[PDB]
Amino acid sequence: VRFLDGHTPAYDLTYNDVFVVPGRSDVASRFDVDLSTVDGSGTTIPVVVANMTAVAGRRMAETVARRGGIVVLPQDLPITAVSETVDFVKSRDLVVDTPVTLSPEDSVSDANALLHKRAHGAAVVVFEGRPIGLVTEANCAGVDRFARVRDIALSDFVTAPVGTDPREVFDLLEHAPIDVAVMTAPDGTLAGVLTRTGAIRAGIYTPAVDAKGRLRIAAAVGINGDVGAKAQALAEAGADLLVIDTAHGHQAKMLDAIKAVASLDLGLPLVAGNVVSAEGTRDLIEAGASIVKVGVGPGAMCTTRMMTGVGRPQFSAVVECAAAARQLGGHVWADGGVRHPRDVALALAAGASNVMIGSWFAGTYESPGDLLFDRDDRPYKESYGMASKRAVASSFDRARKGLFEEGISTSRMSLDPARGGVEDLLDHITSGVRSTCTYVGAANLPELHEKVVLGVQSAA
Amino acid sequence: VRFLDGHTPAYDLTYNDVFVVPGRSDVASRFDVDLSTVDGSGTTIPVVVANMTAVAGRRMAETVARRGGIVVLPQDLPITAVSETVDFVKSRDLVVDTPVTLSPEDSVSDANALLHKRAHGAAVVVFEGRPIGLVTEANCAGVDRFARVRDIALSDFVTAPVGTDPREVFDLLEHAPIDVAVMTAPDGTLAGVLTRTGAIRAGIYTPAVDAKGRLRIAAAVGINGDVGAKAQALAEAGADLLVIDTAHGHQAKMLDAIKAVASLDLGLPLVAGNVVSAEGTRDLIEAGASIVKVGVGPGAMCTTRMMTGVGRPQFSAVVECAAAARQLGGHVWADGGVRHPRDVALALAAGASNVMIGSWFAGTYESPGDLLFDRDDRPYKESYGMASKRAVASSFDRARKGLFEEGISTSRMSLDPARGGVEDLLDHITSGVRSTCTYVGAANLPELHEKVVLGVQSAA
Amino acid sequence: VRFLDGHTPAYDLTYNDVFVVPGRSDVASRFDVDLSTVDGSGTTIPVVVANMTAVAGRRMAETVARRGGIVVLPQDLPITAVSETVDFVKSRDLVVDTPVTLSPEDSVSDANALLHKRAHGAAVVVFEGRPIGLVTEANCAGVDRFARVRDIALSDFVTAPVGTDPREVFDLLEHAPIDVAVMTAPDGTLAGVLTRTGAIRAGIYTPAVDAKGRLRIAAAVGINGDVGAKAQALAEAGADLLVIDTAHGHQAKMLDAIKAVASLDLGLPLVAGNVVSAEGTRDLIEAGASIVKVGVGPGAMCTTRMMTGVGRPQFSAVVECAAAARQLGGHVWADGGVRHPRDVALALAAGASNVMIGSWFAGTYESPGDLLFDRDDRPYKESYGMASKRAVASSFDRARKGLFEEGISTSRMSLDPARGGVEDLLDHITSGVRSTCTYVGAANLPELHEKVVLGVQSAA
């Protein structure tokens, strides 16, 4: 990184403390920028979904991986659930998305509830595998909430075979009342849907795929119990990337856990965290990890900072941790505090190869939580932390532990009425990051870190 | 202390200005950390209750000392009341707590008011020293306000002899409708009570006891009048610790007072304050004090700072006074401005041997003040400062002095509906400090100050 | 009817205008009063549910008929739905009620929604016709709304075979924690449920049953089209009583409708309405009707009165119409304006053999409408009128009808948090009516009309 002459403050820098100075550029268009990563994750955009049960669901895994991102499944998920989730994600089409499906015998109440699990705005009525109609929220309005789907389903819809050029599907939906094109398998059964906006993303985002052409997906593992056996079985389940996650990554028990996984030679990229120091970053890489997760109490007003006083501003942490990782051939992930595309761009300029986002993505249609409404009828979803699942660990013992546990904090994450889907947030984030590179003169993320010039601003 | 490279700001730092950078750690469990102090106070935890009439009651002394703490009785308290208080605290069982007691002829009005004197959630009805029933807030609801305790008491309760293993008492109380175990003397009379959570606390917190195994106790004394006679009168009354307390500790009249008490050779630790300068710590220890209490106008917008402009940020004050005290083999107490476990952890990292807590603990069941409710019906208590009792001191004379006196400031300290008792606040504080040491890599408090690495953060 | 001396006002009387003067009575208990009717309807309580789609569902038909009432199915309801509704009611147990049933694959969202269709407070989980557990509203709280019933169902429940007397079932639920007893057929299949309150009503209410011992049910028909052909189809479907209903019962088109139904000799009671005059009542009986439905715009400020000014106070209408029916051997139903048990008691004293209740019964669990919540989160239901389905009836023609047609008026019917089920409303009504007879000195409804002494009160 480069700072303006004299910009060496006597403190650490948060995302709000720094700004990017424009430089000489020959990159005119945002589309000329290549957002592919070089950390072995296989992502085409520098966005990683945090390993939190409030965010890392099956629909989020499919939706994010299709647009070039990756979702890390939360640690301690039962291996049966991991296998079914991986099999679901790696069976999805690289262009066609999975819609909400309904049976003719389902109620209107279920139809309205189950609909808001995707950003398509319409559900496909299925009878013996075949699409027979579409259900919208307008079809559910003004009708008996326990009526059957058959009574409100619209039998007319735009259809096209799977494999059709998305530009042609875009044409078929130009004068369509419902912006959903139902894609059919050769035998006529349901294969998925494609919207006009979804077809656009097909030509803008490159799907993150493994060697077999299947959508990528990652999964997390804690440092208690048998780390080797769990990470081994997690690799057997089809995970394309393994993340060893703990609150204090710079500890001997985390150091030992990385040695156990590395000694198995699983052939998967290894992330380890969290640390905010150069020494801790070097220690995790020497243990056998190739990627380091950066982020320990980034919020001055958050739980970790106010309970213990331990933490570090995320921007200064990444700058120090990335430089330590760069000389060892490693990479760093910026984990925590991401609320705007600015934080994604600033984290990458500081040296990160990927940016991990948690609570921000919880307020989306694709997150596992249920869609809620506040006193003003504004849509929102509840994010919450992993609490003891990132901590080192008979009625007495449980209660003895229970006294000193970390509580589960819940936060109101409002849904943007114009950006309700996680794909809209990916459009929001990547548009800013691409335009950031045009300001600095970078055609990719490596040139971003190389040519970025940074400055410090006052509290004004 | 060590600061991050370049973190030498051009100003003094308060608790909000600094953060703790994690280091390599082999301390996995919070319970592996030793919170014992080395300043001679006899505490196994770094929490001191301030010498304030709003906080320093008799029930406060019993409850805090059992969990390893120490309570300083407010100065100028009559010597008769001091003796009565000492005899209570040193007559208590190291595990069994003193419950609220009720007579069968008492009113429901009294029972409801007396119930909130402890955090047990139930009061034991006593007849001729014998427990005959329990009274809860549920028994007081919906009944006549002037009905007798006899009419609402629950005659069924779990009982066990005093001295029984607290691990046993815990399992006896699972299927009891009231989570209060009534402990009995050999002759069947009331000895105290023990809750499920209180039974767990017996195996987590070590009682702060004197050489005879009696709960420890402190004492404060002003600098007006005969300091030697007052210090001796409280020492013979059973105090294990003496606090010479005033607003401006760096004064010649203060030095005379410490020399007067030290020349008595009472054999007890001498605490003296308050100063926030390196010279102030040197002069007070040279006078004969072993512990220097640090804290003068720590709040920028508090009364002392707004009236005189005199003060100093508490963290920079402590770290300077801690550095000076070490060179003379003394210790320092961080007194003032503590509102979160972060403040306790940073005070210890800065070099203080103990953290003095006052107004924060006023909003607890164990504080002497009355439980009040706001316009939202939420519980709170009124904390207030000592005013002139920490200041050096015909009818014309009475008026002129009273005219310039510092007024009593009142502040509302809300009770946490989940942490209504002071023991819950001690759980909150120690959990953070224990977690802090695991982040720093220290197994005890001296190692905390030795291994801590801190940084400065911006206003963002 | 007898009025006090001088109580001959120069106007007609509503239910608010009159009162009952107590008389000498030897009827001590409410249980000594016989509420059975003599009008041929077969009801054992003087309560009939109006032919309104807002109230006349199958859950209401079963619940009211079991307690001695009868429900009139709304006119123009398809004949296929008639047979399905009648066959359901005619197959219900005279003591055992039909609970809400759930599949282990049903969602918690559907479980909470379906719960409010009965007053049992719990739904029975069914697999292949056999009960496996119950789901309560408490079971749905705090869990994911898309969790499965199988994950929250309680496997423990009191069960008893069908045919057990309600007294012993009452005892089995005395110390059962949740007041639902599952009734099973001899083969172990689900026969229904019986609650402690439902067991009590079995000894209080006599079910209204046909000659085969099956619950009674009535149905309404309009005077448009082929009234005779429709009326025969309703009789063949199993209806026990037919109601020929129109807005203006005193018209030639209504008279021809009665003759058509009478000439078919269906063997059922013939109800005709609506009129509010002695001549109108006598004309309908001469046409072939045995029961005349009384009620034309009884509300002073209702829609009918405000559009046309046509109507009559219901109490004076019933008095005049009943006396006219008495001389011709007929009976009258009080239809409209019923809001309290007072209206039922006053209608019977005025000479009506039955009281028709509509919008009041809409705010019940058993009504067909879905349970709603207002801005204060209070439960309520929407009542609404029959509009053109009670009125005499190309594109230009259809538009002319809609232009001058009567709109559908909607009204919010709040649920009593203590009287949520329609059986509680029947308990509220019959308690007052039985108490009314004890004040008058009547052992039955004929004695009520025979011994009643009435008075008029002013607006005070």
Ligand SMILES: O=c1[nH]cnc2c1ncn2[C@@H]1O[C@H](COP(=O)(O)O)[C@@H](O)[C@H]1O
């Ligand atoms: O399109 C759909 N049709 C039917 N059930 C669905 C659909 N999407 C999600 N579900 C159900 O919703 C629940 C939770 O789904 P998740 O939140 O996507 O994991 C499970 O019971 C799923 O079967």
Ligand SMILES: O=c1[nH]cnc2c1ncn2[C@@H]1O[C@H](COP(=O)(O)O)[C@@H](O)[C@H]1O
């Ligand atoms: O319970 C918790 N307490 C504190 N930090 C947490 C907890 N659960 C997850 N985290 C961290 O916070 C990150 C998400 O931060 P976010 O992107 O600001 O929501 C995760 O990736 C974890 O590193």
Ligand SMILES: O=c1[nH]cnc2c1ncn2[C@@H]1O[C@H](COP(=O)(O)O)[C@@H](O)[C@H]1O
């Ligand atoms: O357990 C108890 N039973 C009855 N009175 C009590 C109890 N604890 C305190 N009190 C009374 O409460 C008042 C103040 O007590 P303090 O707040 O402990 O100083 C005095 O009148 C005490 O006698």
Ligand SMILES: O=c1[nH]cnc2c1ncn2[C@@H]1O[C@H](COP(=O)(O)O)[C@@H](O)[C@H]1O
């Ligand atoms: O009236 C007063 N004015 C100023 N400082 C006071 C007063 N009373 C007590 N103090 C100091 O404030 C400390 C308590 O600080 P707290 O815990 O932040 O309320 C005490 O231990 C005293 O050192």
Ligand SMILES: O=c1[nH]cnc2c1ncn2[C@@H]1O[C@H](COP(=O)(O)O)[C@@H](O)[C@H]1O
């Ligand atoms: O116990 C029940 N289980 C499941 N669905 C029910 C139950 N009772 C009523 N319904 C549904 O309610 C609707 C009929 O409404 P109704 O005619 O008012 O009872 C249909 O969608 C039924 O499947």
Ligand SMILES: O=c1[nH]cnc2c1ncn2[C@@H]1O[C@H](COP(=O)(O)O)[C@@H](O)[C@H]1O
């Ligand atoms: O749309 C309508 N307009 C006017 N009267 C109606 C309508 N629907 C039903 N009614 C009458 O009102 C009665 C119910 O009155 P309630 O018991 O006071 O609600 C029914 O039995 C009908 O006689």
